[PDB]
Paper text:
A crystal structure of apo-LmCld was solved and refined at a resolution of 2.0 Å. The overall structure of apo-LmCld subunit is composed of an N- and a C-terminal ferredoxin-like domain, as also observed in other Clds. In the crystal lattice apo-LmCld forms a homopentamer, compared to the hexameric assembly in solution. No electron density corresponding to heme was detected in the active site cavity of the C-terminal ferredoxin-like domain, despite the presence of a potential histidine residue as proximal ligand. In functional Clds a hydrogen bond between the proximal histidine and a neighboring glutamate stabilizes the position of the heme ligand. In contrast, an alanine replaces the glutamate in apo-LmCld. The distal site differs in having a glutamine residue at the position of the distal arginine which was shown to be of high importance for catalytic chlorite degrading activity. Moreover, similar to the Cld-like proteins from T. thermophilus and G. stearothermophilus, apo-LmCld contains a flexible stretch of amino acids between residues V105 and K141, as indicated by higher temperature factors and weaker electron density for these residues. This flexible stretch of residues aligns with the substrate channel forming α-helix of chlorite degrading chlorite dismutases and has a major impact on the access to the heme binding site, as shown by tunnel calculations in the respective proteins using CAVER. While in NdCld the access to the heme is very large, in apo-LmCld the access is significantly different and narrower, since the flexible stretch of amino acids is positioned in front of the putative heme binding site, as also reflected in diverse characteristics of the access channels.
Numbering used by the authors:
A (entry chain D): 7 to 111, 122 to 251
B (entry chain C): 6 to 111, 123 to 251
C (entry chain A), E (entry chain E): 5 to 251
D (entry chain B): 7 to 111, 123 to 251
Amino acid sequence: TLDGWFCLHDFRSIDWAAWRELNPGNQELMLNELSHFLSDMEITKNIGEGEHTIYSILGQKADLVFFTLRDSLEALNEVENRFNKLAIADYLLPTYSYISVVELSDDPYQNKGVRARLYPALPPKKHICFYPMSKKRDGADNWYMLPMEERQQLIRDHGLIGRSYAGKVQQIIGGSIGFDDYEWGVTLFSDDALEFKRIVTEMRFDEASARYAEFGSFFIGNLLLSEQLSKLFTI
Amino acid sequence: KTLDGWFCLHDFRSIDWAAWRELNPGNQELMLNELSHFLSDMEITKNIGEGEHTIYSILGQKADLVFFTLRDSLEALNEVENRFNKLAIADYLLPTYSYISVVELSDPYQNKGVRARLYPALPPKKHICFYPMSKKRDGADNWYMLPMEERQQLIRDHGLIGRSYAGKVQQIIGGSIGFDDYEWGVTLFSDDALEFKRIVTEMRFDEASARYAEFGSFFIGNLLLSEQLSKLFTI
Amino acid sequence: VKTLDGWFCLHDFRSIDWAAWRELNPGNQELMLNELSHFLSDMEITKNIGEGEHTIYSILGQKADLVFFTLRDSLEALNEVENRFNKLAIADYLLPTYSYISVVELSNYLASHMAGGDDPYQNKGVRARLYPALPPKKHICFYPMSKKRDGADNWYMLPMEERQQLIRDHGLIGRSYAGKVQQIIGGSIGFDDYEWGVTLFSDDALEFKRIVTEMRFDEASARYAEFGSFFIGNLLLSEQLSKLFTI
Amino acid sequence: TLDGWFCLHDFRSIDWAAWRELNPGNQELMLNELSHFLSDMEITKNIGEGEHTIYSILGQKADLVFFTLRDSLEALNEVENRFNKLAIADYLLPTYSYISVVELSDPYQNKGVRARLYPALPPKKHICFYPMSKKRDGADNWYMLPMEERQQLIRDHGLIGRSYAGKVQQIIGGSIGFDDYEWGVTLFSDDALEFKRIVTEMRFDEASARYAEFGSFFIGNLLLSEQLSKLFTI
Amino acid sequence: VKTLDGWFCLHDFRSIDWAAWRELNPGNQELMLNELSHFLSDMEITKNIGEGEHTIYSILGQKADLVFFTLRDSLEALNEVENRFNKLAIADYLLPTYSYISVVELSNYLASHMAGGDDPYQNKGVRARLYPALPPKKHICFYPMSKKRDGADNWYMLPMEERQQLIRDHGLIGRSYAGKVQQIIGGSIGFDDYEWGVTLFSDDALEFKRIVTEMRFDEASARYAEFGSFFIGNLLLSEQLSKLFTI
Ligand SMILES: [K+]
Ligand SMILES: [K+]
Ligand SMILES: [K+]
Ligand SMILES: [K+]
Ligand SMILES: [K+]
């Protein structure tokens, strides 16, 4: 398999109780520093050395997710440390995270059609859906014990689903074997959140997932631009 | 395929009685008045027909209160969530659990009986019961690997039980595949709590649930009107 | 599959915040304990009029320091006890660690009374089970449990007569411990995370270990029982609460 | 099944941050109170009413374990409450605990049996604790086995512990009805590698291989009362 | 089913409390960083006299920020390092998030040395594996694991000759990533919650994903492996600390 950018899903909850105690002046300074940090990220993306986006997560799991993509673990780890060193980061409590690397099955690494997948531009879709997953190794339902022939056939039929949801849902698959607790981090983008439920359900009735898919938690959110972050942190 | 309605937020909170006690009577009253106006705007959204909301006092240590909110978009639902947390009193309402889903039903949308289910008016029943569930995918007991006909039969016989409790137990089924950790969010309303125990027990002896259902935690509570909030928060 | 249901129950486990408690002066500790004694006397009044029950046991281990087992005829009454308790000044030092909600349950697998076109709730023998007076046994044992639904071992796919047989044989063991162990079975399907909440009372702790062990070799439990956490404790009277909260 | 002393495994973590903020004056006073506490524990030991020991645990699970044995649940709980009421206990955060009773699958007045039911804790250099239960999962159901089969398994299992005798001392505490697992196993040895050897060897015997379910494992080093002041001294 | 055992191991995962650390002035932060430096210099001495090893990596994600992998020849020494570490003033800002105790292990499935009535612990080649020098690779990968004992897939019920074949085929994959991935196998049966603590080192993190994936398709792991949490990190030298702890 061919690998692309290293990915970080960073889920945060806003400590409103502490944030409320800050005067408007200091709240302004911390947001000013954040905007500067966000402009930094934008520059890295403009030179094609990374990607990033922010979505507001629903429910008590988190308030925000910071999805970041970079060319190396060193180039990903300093973003994480640089972010935590921000003043406002004290009010962004860690609730969950995920580490992965963009994954995909004559040089392919120059094929500009393949580059668009390994180093994907993040679409500004209204909504986002994230969940980790793994392939089962339980009794008769053991994905990794399947023959090469049958196992590939399951992947074939599975791919036809996402193929049918083209223009409705965009997927980013990140392998996490050796990097995190599950085997894949799946990120979905769409302007209609209902499409997330439809594709994952339709997938769940397909044998590939119906028999071998193990799922972690599901996180769903809405697009959050810089022009929306200010009113968000304004009580 | 299914039909979807309002997006749902079950927001469970525990009351920080230790912290709340430290507030003088004056400050406690101001925060209640701020909450009162918040609920007033919730009532506006309810009247205009762009959602619903209700509050119940939960029994046990899982929570003290549940804020069940329904809206016509995820943006609107996240708005209520953040706006709620920005309240002064919210600092004393600690998050213990939450669930995200959308009202689900298996043209119809302009059929005045269907929309009544997809956009349900919350009845002022004396008790509520909530629990998340999922259909199992474990060996011989795999719901999503069953033939279509066998599935319909199991759903059919399951449906027979629900209609037998009509007039005693009102249900709201919220699909959460792609939205949360389980596959459905079940909400029951009844004036007799024991009806919850009767319908869920009877269901559990039906094959659809007996063989294929997985259950999360169960939350039961009592109806709490806005007028009774002042008395509740008075030590 | 049918049940007779009595009092709604609350097992309220609490841990004592000794760090915060030792900061109060004896005068303030006295006022809080005074308010608690009043609260507990209120509970006793409800008991004396036959509209509920309550008891306190000291739990061993880090799971909890105290359990407050309370029984009431409605969830509105039960919740009110809960809210009223937390509003106590001393409750700020009683940290929640675990709880359970159930209702006293009598299943119809075996009979509890003669069936003669007759109202069971008027049967005093039945009422003594539905609305049980709590015995002042020296020790308590609580654990939630459920019936498995796992492949070949699926309790809820069994025929009625087969479940009857299993409950019957299970019962034989249960009644061999009559006079040594008293049992309160609370159904919690639809009310909590497990399907039942079992409370045992005895003047000898080892009896808890004996009955549960012997049950575990009986097919009803050996094959179909799924257990949660176990809690063991000692009876705590009001006349030794002041000694407990005194450092 | 014969039953002896009631047991408490009390695992604690040291709040170094809060402990550091205390000036050495308070720290010494709290350590003195703990010394008087442990002094009274030794009296109970010498008269023959109970036992106690302390071990420094490795890893983040805990820093210390207080293993206490008493004749009744009243006395055990009293020590537990007496311990928490100590000023120093505020800096000893609870991380894990276990309740059991010394189990032995008129014998009660025989010195030989009493040595088992009411065991003196050896001052071995190391300790190992883990809870466990017997499986009731599908075809692997220990409690649905015929007695004759179950007896042979226990017999084949017993042979292992006896070969490790003198190198590893074991205290089995039954916890059915008392805690979340069915047994609490405590091992003592002057060589921690012996723990790894006996548990490994046991796990290949059909009794544990097929029917054992384990909880968390805790390893620690012997810690005397005189070593506490230098442990808590930064 | 014997093993050769070397240094006792401690993986100490920590997270940086940036909020509290920020409140500290650079004068005090400097002082704590200096104390940490003297601590690591003492660790270097122990390493130079040959009484153990130690290294530090920066973990990615919220699981941790740092891991302090330490190796010693006794549990007394290993626990003293642990106690000394926490007694550091800077340690208050290093919150414990996870840990794993184990000992460097060589299984007897395949031979590590030739026969001869010849003590293996005197073999220079064996000692190099039991008391391994930590390679300064760019990245690290740690994960605990255990062999399954679930129904048909029961590793500990397998015949010896079958476990051998499985480990043999398993070893071929590991031996194929030579010069790219170095492995430290720490046995933890009786020491921690899993049966092994596996530590990988490589200058290319993708090799971790490559080896574990290929391994997971081999029957030994495809059928019998149980995995815990995975931790991925970047190498961090003592001179890089002050850089890291500068806001
Ligand atoms: K949120
Ligand atoms: K409550
Ligand atoms: K206790
Ligand atoms: K430790
Ligand atoms: K990190």
